Amino acid sequence: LVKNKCVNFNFNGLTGTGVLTESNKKFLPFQQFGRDIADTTDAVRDPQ
């Protein structure tokens, strides 16, 4: 992982560019990523 930098990423086949930081929100145990009301990806779970 590389937190707090603009990086290009691939989490388990989900890809993008952005800055990664530790979230206050928490998913259900089967959920893998979050989307907002516009359907952009706003959060992700680290597979490791």
Binding site: I37, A38, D39, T40
Partner: protein, 45 residues
């Protein structure tokens, strides 16, 4: 003068009450701005 001032003070009280319930003209401008931007971003998919 006493009666006129009492009617005025009473009428302001009813405005304050009514506004604690009418802003549709302002709210729908806010709604239309947001709805247009959400449409513009959804349309990228």
């Amino acid at each position: 003068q006493k009666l006129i001032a009492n009617q005025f003070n009473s009428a302001i009280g009813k405005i304050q009450d009514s506004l604690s319930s009418a802003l549709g003209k302002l709210q729908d401008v806010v709604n239309q701005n947001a709805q247009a931007l959400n449409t513009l971003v959804k349309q990228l998919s």
